[PDB]
Amino acid sequence: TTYADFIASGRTGRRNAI
Amino acid sequence: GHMGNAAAAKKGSEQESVKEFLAKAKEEFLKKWESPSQNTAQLDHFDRIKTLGTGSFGRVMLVKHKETGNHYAMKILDKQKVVKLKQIEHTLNEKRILQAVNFPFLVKLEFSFKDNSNLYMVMEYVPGGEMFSHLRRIGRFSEPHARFYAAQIVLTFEYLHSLDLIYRDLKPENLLIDQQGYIQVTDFGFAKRVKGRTWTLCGTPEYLAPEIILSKGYNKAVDWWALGVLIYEMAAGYPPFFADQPIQIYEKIVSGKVRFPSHFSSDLKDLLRNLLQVDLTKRFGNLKNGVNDIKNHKWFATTDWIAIYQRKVEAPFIPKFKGPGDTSNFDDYEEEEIRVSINEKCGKEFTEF
Ligand SMILES: CCCNCCNS(=O)(=O)c1cccc2cnccc12
């Protein structure tokens, strides 16, 4: 599922600006 | 048509009252923009309590003003590190913006000052924590909940854009929940005051509009794209474009094929398809009707814009308050000493702070 993909993405935590 | 006489007159009048408000707001902003405040406190006026998190180019600490007992959130910027990262102008501009703007959902700069080593931006302490924390804790917000927050961002962007400010770092991590459950936008480290087009590649990957990624220039409509991303993430619990690595995120953004959870309402999907719109001749917030295409969209039909501005709407979530200076709504962070060199660093570069 999309949610499972999100959890597997490694980007569920805080995201810094570039 | 969609509106009878009374409703059409009411909407027309409301839209004219926004114009009058924004005209006065710009007058007030420009006075402070042209004559910024400087050096309104010093470090030994404050007790350092605990690190609350980060902001662009620095770390944010909960502090207590010794003489009054009032708590604040103080961003500490190491001048040498700012120089090395080529962020001098950004940091000066963040403080200049913060001291000049005034809006109920923009965090206020209560004091600022500098010393031999660091710059200090002492902001209001917003004790409810990041929206990010609450969103990840409960998974996703209901549409009414997401809409309450979204309305505050719409009004805030309406205000900022009228001042020719582009915000450029909307995300749940930068939105703090205050004691009444309303949102406070933080971090103007990537904002820019410019009329028309600009080109800088900056922001947070998941929230970048296609035109930021691509070499073409862009305008304030990037913030309306980012609003689309935020609304989607609030309502879904995850953003519309993600991947393991930023480069792959950018490919998905530029492809632009948005898909929605089956629980999204039709009104929500319609709004999001008009915000997450690659074509700038079609993106809401960028058309002849401006912000009104957003404010008058069916998904916002229940939103009383003035009541949101006046903070008269009951918020969906009121954070717990354990007492003055409580940080229970925040993650714990590494505690870094504040060192102040006996030698002034980078004085000429930061004269204006
Ligand atoms: C990528 C993660 C970004 N986090 C941004 C928020 N950081 S913060 O929570 O230390 C914070 C920052 C600024 C003002 C504050 C005012 N009251 C409280 C906290 C504040």
User: What would you report as the Rg of chain A, rounded to the nearest angstrom?
Assistant: 9 Å
CATH fold field value of the largest domain in chain B: Transferase(Phosphotransferase), domain 1
Taking the alpha carbons of the first and last residues of chain B, their distance comes to 54 Å
* Relative helix content of chain A: 25-40%
Q: Could you give the order of strands across the largest sheet of chain B?
A: 1-2-3-5-4
Number of strands of chain A: 0
Beta content of chain A comes to: under 5%
CATH class category label of the largest domain in chain B: Mainly Alpha
- Assign the CATH superfamily of the largest domain in chain B: Transferase(Phosphotransferase) domain 1
- Distance between the ends of chain A: 28 Å
Q: What is the overall shape of chain B?
A: globular
Q: What's the helix count of chain A?
A: 1
Overall outline of chain A: elongated
Describe the structure concisely for a colleague.
The complex is a heterodimer of chains A (18) and B (353). With 18 residues, chain A is mostly helical.
Describe this structure as you would to a colleague.
The complex is a heterodimer of chains A (about 20) and B (about 350). Chain A contains 1 helix and no strands. Chain A is mainly alpha-helical. In chain B, the strands form 3 sheets. Chain B has a 5-stranded antiparallel β-sheet. In chain B, strands 6-9 form a two-stranded antiparallel sheet. In chain B, a hairpin with a 5-residue loop joins β2 (about 60-65) and β3. Chain B starts with a helix and ends in a 44-residue tail after the last helix. The interface of A and B includes residues 2, 6, 15 and 18 of A. The PDB classes it as transferase. The entry lists the keywords PKA, 3x-Phosphorylated, Transferase. The assembly is dimeric.
